[PDB]
Design an enzyme around this catalytic site. Structure first.
Site, mmCIF file in Angstrom:
data_model
loop_
_atom_site.group_PDB
_atom_site.id
_atom_site.type_symbol
_atom_site.label_atom_id
_atom_site.label_comp_id
_atom_site.label_asym_id
_atom_site.label_seq_id
_atom_site.Cartn_x
_atom_site.Cartn_y
_atom_site.Cartn_z
ATOM 1 N NE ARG A 181 5.819 17.892 11.987
ATOM 2 C CZ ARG A 181 5.996 18.655 13.145
ATOM 3 N NH1 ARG A 181 6.691 18.281 14.306
ATOM 4 N NH2 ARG A 181 5.803 20.194 12.904
ATOM 5 C CG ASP A 232 -2.000 0.901 1.194
ATOM 6 O OD1 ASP A 232 -2.403 1.506 -0.241
ATOM 7 O OD2 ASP A 232 -2.727 1.554 2.038
ATOM 8 N NE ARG A 248 14.002 8.477 15.020
ATOM 9 C CZ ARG A 248 13.117 7.727 15.901
ATOM 10 N NH1 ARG A 248 12.142 8.186 16.562
ATOM 11 N NH2 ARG A 248 13.265 6.334 15.707
ATOM 12 C CG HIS A 273 4.784 7.760 0.254
ATOM 13 N ND1 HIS A 273 5.345 8.680 -0.432
ATOM 14 C CD2 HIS A 273 4.444 8.057 1.638
ATOM 15 C CE1 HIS A 273 5.398 9.884 0.189
ATOM 16 N NE2 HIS A 273 4.822 9.595 1.730
#
Lengths: 218, 527, 526, 527
Positions: free
Chosen positions: C422, C291, C400, C296
């Site tokens: 972020r 998914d 991170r 991504h």
């Protein structure tokens, strides 16, 4: 105190006095009484045994600064007066206000220890009145439960050998170092007593001095 | 450090006050500009309010023939009447499914039997009935509520006063299973007129039985009524105790400054009854003592007692504070909970919990619970909070007890722990225990003395009153309710999964000896 | 106005609560929360002169579908309001269902989902005028010829200098019909010879494994090449990609530490609070890895880990995406922890298995943590952790980077530096370092340096990119192949039952074993 | 609220009455025990009294040859005789310094000239002289008073009646400078015999001229005579007016309930004379109108009119009430006082105040004063009280006028302010003005009507009588006198310091126009 033994109490009397700064003239308001309205108390200067031009204070308000962790920035006010409006000796501790959230529906708590004209000790707090939380009442909680009088109490104390309430030599020295510069300033004429009428509270300036040094009337 | 936290709050509040003092003389961007610049430096006497007697009011008691409504709600409205706190043009409509013929005989035989007989109120009974109507309907037919709407408007337009429209309090004295449909019904066509009138809805416990069940109901009702309108009622939380908790503390520097970890040794909230459950296993056995009064009643008391300082006495400010402190509570653990179930009294007058037809034989359901909560914040970390509830015990008592830390030095055994008690049952009482000198002459000759801090509709009645006045303080808000359930549900699961078990105790005793051991092992010292 | 005494008090009440939560050292915090508490206009056209020089037509296939009406069309609307569409733009919703009243369709199917913002809503009617409805098959050449004529019509009427027209085809469709739509376009509705490009946006999934993905790429390549083909990933924002590329490559300081000898671990995290929301049946075929992770998160990894591009041209960036992916070893089952959510505490999210459209005994992961090993000079021995989760504790997407500790000399008076990029729930980029506190050197403070200075959102950014012909943030055919070769063995192991998802409660962080896995693969909490 | 204050007093008084009803059947500790338990639930016709004609009585008029005694005191005793209110064995001794030979010619030439010639009394003149003796002495020699003591005992032991000893009224018709020595003298050796007899001492104004001077005299006299014995007399305060003030109000719910802030708009007490001061600047100029009749005469009238309700008609209860209300009065301010001094009448018959040999040229002494007092208590706060005194004005008048608030609704201009007037000069009159219907027929056809509330020794005479009867009501008590002086002295100082000045007014006018403006600007509306 390290204990409730007399000399332990006296050690602590000494230590705190040692933290007090010498009183300045700027933190002192003097008064000298004039005749009462009914003339039962002749004016201080009407007394023939008082020398002309006397500047002697029959009244004094002043502020002391105790420079230690416990007391820094807390005004201690000593007030003594002859020929004022009533006979009275008391300690009044006024606590800081809680502005939020009651606002004007509360006011500063007090603890009062009175010895004259009778013994009382009590706290003023605000409580609810028996719908709104904003509806409040200032109330007094009595904390106090032929005994000998104060003077008799001390003589009895001396007979039993209890030193607590007597000024020790070192304590005394320190007490004089708090007041002596002020007394020198007063004896050199740098502060002048304000005339007040006997039977009144004293000079209006003394009350303003109290209200300017951390006390709120409400 | 404890003094600096309070000082930080008091500073922030003082800065907001000087912004307020400026920004009340001629916009968000004036906050920021002022921020930088501050840095650089007998007869019913009507007691009702003007607004109250200024627009019409209809109270609709749904489920008006049910036990709750006739034995509790209507007698409670009756007392508010007698105490002169209902508006004089008050309309009250009992709504219910049974069709009735002689409306006046219903008021007398279903309602009046249960009114207060006391002679100070006897006089007023017939007076109060003139204000009551009957309405027969169901709880889901849009038709019936359009019919009700017309009946209400009838009474509303007949009001002999200045403002038009009418305020409507809908009281659902109903099983919770029907709350959603009744609420949708009122939305579809019995809301107050467009011209004017607030709407408010009182709903009754249980508010679910866990996090999941409670949130379903909240989601169910929230499409139709928001948190300014919904009033989840707790019959047992009285005005007098709430004010004792909030005022005594927050109006007073003396108490406020000691209301913390640095000064308080331990805190117990206690709810005790001598009565048992006999013949009510029908409700109780599914619920238990924890869901009955602890998750809902004791926890609101806790919230009010433990909350940080609200900026004002506005109701939603107080509720914000209840929520924040509840969020600091760790979910109760089975390691911090002692349960009991009562058996027959030694004397054999009161029968045991299982000795009841309406109670599943072998039931494991607690009639007693003592538990330790941990509040993890700057103010409360490490302080034991003990909640205690029990049925069929030695006395009928409800009180907060705060035990403060000893000053060991220098009085030693000539002093002991100060306490503060706020009692509501069997009667109101609030006192501090402190140590004083006795006259006549050693410094260590001391007494304990209880100072009395003390200076009327009952608990239930005063909640109905607050709701009429539009005051949400003592009502559990949606977010508040969720957090409370999250504090108790995991323990309730461990209980249903059998992981801890109730200890038997004879009706009329304190409860299980283990409970007192538990208490004493959680910071409390007997006086 | 006794309701001016009220509203400002509520303002103050909110400020109060902000400061008491955050507890700043207060004037300046109030200042910068007042401005975050604020935070009929003509559309000024911000489009290039090449974009206004020729007609543009955008054809959304599957126009009445949930993707197209809830996401694509609102996106195009936002771009229109932002001046990023040419003034004479033609947009056609192509779908299979006959519609009596196209104007009703526009209001009811599209306008309903347009941002109800004041400064947007008052353009809606003007936008609808650029939209037509077209009813046709996805596989019939004659329907595309009929479409072609509808378009030529609008093109040949263009009030502007160049002839012909540019055509963007948006395939808001299942992948099963892509080959036929593409073939139909090839034969039936390519741009006029006189002039204009053809671009085709296609949606995931791009297959479900190496083989199926390659099959699909071979099925499309005879019709459109990689200059024309735009495999969209909705979540990859322009703003995060500039963070990844500029911060690093323009700066000696960040270039020099971006490697094995200074980095302890790298974690790319995708977290949502929502569950499958009734559509479990569809998700059950795909699972969390296919998914969002293979597509991504891997594109993020690629961009983060790539060697320096020969230039900032799109295909140079893509070459480097390809090269670094080629160095990644296939993920092993041992480096993978799976989760499957159960009901939230308040029941707002029913358990994954409570969904009736999920088949009994489903083992489908809604959560996954895994470790990738990039075997090259820059990255050898550096753990890269990909984490994706539905129905966890917050909505959040971030990189991170944790740097190696300096044990000596500060010891416990320091801790590992971090760089955080972020994107959700808002954009931030910052470094955690230790600084001195204003006697002892041992007295230190962890501090955060903000590196980050109505723009379009991530999805809108990509559609704009496709309109301008910037391929950077789109997965190229070869890149895609390599990505499938990283994940496919793991997916086979998972489909053969060799790894089992650990149940976690919705609203929690996920299985405790996933956090332990992170802490065992080079991450320190402090 | 006004009704609740009166109700609180009436409750307290009712509780004290039921204590009284119990504690009159078989000790302080019975009050406390009953308190807790109440919670849980022609020829002289002799009119004299029996006690009066039961023991001997000697009235000693000291300073018997002075103007006051011969022209006022003795003629006043003569009238009491004629009116049958002196005991029949009454001994009366004029004491004075001049030695006299023919005692009988003194009675005739010094005393009788000034007796009442009226034919109803002419007959009795010689009768009354048989009761009078002469005594020659000084006011400080202990010797003379021992001599007097022997003379009194002579007359006392000769009394032909049951009880032994003798009652003694000492009347000091003397300058106040000698009061202290005469009083000490009487103490040392002329008090009544040990066996029996009261002693009473009537002293004459001025009672000082300010707080200081007045308190000196009080301290001077108080070693020798207490407040049950001392009688500071005010010649002008009559029984008839005092009873009108007390009875009309306190015996009647109708008046009592309206005697307050909530009902009264304004109150004026007025003392007006046409006579001037000619040839008496000798006393007046040092005294002024304020000290002459306002500090002493008007203020006692005020006290009686404004006082709270006494628990009984016992004299000291009434006096307690006079003191409490006087203590609520703010010291009069120079901002609330308009002064006048009279000049010659327009017609030129009456000469101006300064046109007198016995008056310091340029004197600033007020012959006229209007002033506003503020009584700060629950009953009177905000109510204007106006005192007015003036010499050489248009008429001889003394009256209280109470003006009540209008009922504006619903009669409007068909009604006006009710009033109550209590007049003593030039004659007694007491009436209320109210609005009534007229017969023959609209509701707004109304009339003003004065209702007469009315149903003998003069003022001075009746005070001497009260003192014989031992009734202190209308006499100023020591504490009372002090408070009155404190109300007036600060204003009197500001006057002596020139801070406000008298306005000239022609003898025979109302007084200064500014005075009437002052009145109308202080709440009074002309009818």
């Amino acid at each position: 105190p390290r204990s409730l033994d007399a000399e332990c109490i006296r050690d602590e009397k000494v230590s705190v006095l040692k933290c007090i700064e010498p009183i300045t003239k700027e933190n002192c308001v003097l008064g000298q009484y004039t005749a009462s309205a009914d003339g039962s108390i002749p004016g201080y200067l009407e007394d023939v045994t008082v020398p002309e031009g006397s500047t002697c204070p029959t009244f004094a308000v002043m502020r002391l600064n105790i420079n230690n962790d416990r007391w820094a920035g807390v005004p201690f006010i000593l007030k003594a007066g002859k020929a004022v409006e009533q006979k009275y000796v008391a300690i009044r501790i006024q606590f800081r206000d809680e502005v939020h959230p009651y606002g004007e529906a509360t006011q500063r708590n007090e603890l009062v220890i009175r010895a004259q004209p009778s013994e009382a000790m009590y706290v003023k707090i605000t409580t609810k009145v028996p719908g709104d939380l904003r509806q409040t009442h200032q109330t007094e909680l009595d904390l106090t439960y032929r005994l000998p009088d104060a003077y008799e109490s001390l003589i009895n104390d001396a007979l039993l050998g209890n030193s607590t309430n007597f000024v020790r030599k070192d304590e005394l020295d320190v007490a004089w170092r708090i007041f002596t510069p002020l007394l020198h300033q007063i004896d050199s004429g740098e502060i002048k007593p304000i005339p007040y009428q006997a039977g009144t509270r004293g000079p209006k300036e003394a009350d303003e001095f109290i209200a300017n040094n951390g006390f709120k009337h409400q | 450090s404890h003094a600096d936290q309070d000082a930080y709050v008091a500073d922030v509040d003082g800065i907001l006050d000087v912004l307020r003092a400026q920004v009340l003389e001629r916009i968000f961007q004036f906050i920021s500009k002022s921020a930088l610049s501050l840095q650089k430096d007998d007869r019913i006497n009507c007691k009702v309010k003007d607004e109250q007697k200024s627009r019409a009011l209809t109270i609709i008691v749904f489920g008006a023939s049910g036990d709750l409504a006739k034995k509790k709600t209507f007698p409670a409205l009756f007392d508010l009447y007698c105490g002169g706190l209902l508006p004089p043009e008050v309309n009250i409509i009992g709504y219910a499914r049974t069709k009735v013929d002689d409306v006046e005989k219903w008021k007398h035989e279903t309602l009046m039997k249960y009114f207060s007989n006391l002679s100070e109120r006897g006089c007023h009974a017939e007076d109060f009935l003139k204000h009551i109507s009957y309405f027969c309907g169901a709880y889901d037919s849009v038709d019936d509520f359009k019919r009700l709407d017309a009946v209400i408007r009838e009474k509303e337009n007949a009001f002999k006063g200045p403002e038009k429209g009418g305020n409507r309090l809908f009281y659902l004295a109903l099983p919770p299973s029907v709350f959603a449909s009744v609420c949708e019904s009122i939305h579809k066509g019995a809301m107050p007129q467009e011209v004017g009138g607030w709407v408010r809805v009182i709903i009754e416990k249980p508010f679910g039985r866990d996090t999941k069940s409670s949130a379903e109901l909240s989601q169910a009702l929230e499409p139709f009524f928001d948190e300014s309108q919904l009033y989840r009622i707790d019959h047992y939380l009285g005005k007098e105790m709430v004010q004792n908790i909030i005022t005594t503390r927050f109006a007073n520097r003396i108490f406020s400054a000691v209301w913390n970890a640095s000064n308080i040794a331990c805190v117990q909230i206690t709810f005790k009854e001598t009565i048992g459950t006999e013949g009510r296993g029908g409700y109780f056995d599914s619920i238990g003592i924890i869901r009955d009064v602890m998750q809902n009643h004791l926890t609101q008391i806790l919230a009010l007692l433990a909350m940080e300082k609200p900026r004002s006495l506005d109701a939603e400010c107080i509720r914000d504070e209840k929520v924040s402190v509840l969020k600091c509570i760790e979910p109760i653990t089975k390691e911090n909970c002692v349960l009991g179930q009562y058996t027959a009294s030694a004397d054999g007058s009161i029968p045991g919990y299982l000795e009841d037809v309406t109670v599943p034989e072998g039931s494991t359901c607690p009639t007693f619970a003592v538990m330790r909560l941990n509040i993890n914040n700057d103010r409360w970390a490490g302080v034991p909070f003990i909640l205690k509830a029990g049925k069929a015990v030695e006395q009928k008592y409800v009180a907060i007890r705060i035990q403060f830390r000893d000053e060991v030095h220098p009085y030693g055994e000539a002093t002991q722990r100060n306490e503060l008690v706020i009692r509501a049952q069997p009667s109101e009482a609030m006192y501090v225990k402190i140590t004083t000198k006795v006259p006549g002459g050693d410094l260590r000759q001391t007494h304990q003395t209880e100072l009395d801090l003390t200076y009327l509709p009952d608990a239930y009645e005063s909640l109905i009153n607050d709701a009429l006045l539009g005051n949400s303080t003592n009502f559990v808000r949606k977010d508040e309710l969720d957090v409370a359930w999250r504090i108790f549900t995991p323990l309730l699961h461990q209980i249903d999964s059998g992981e801890i078990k109730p200890i038997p105790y004879q009706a009329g005793t304190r409860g299980p000896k283990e409970a007192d051991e538990f208490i004493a092992n959680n910071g409390f010292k007997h006086q």
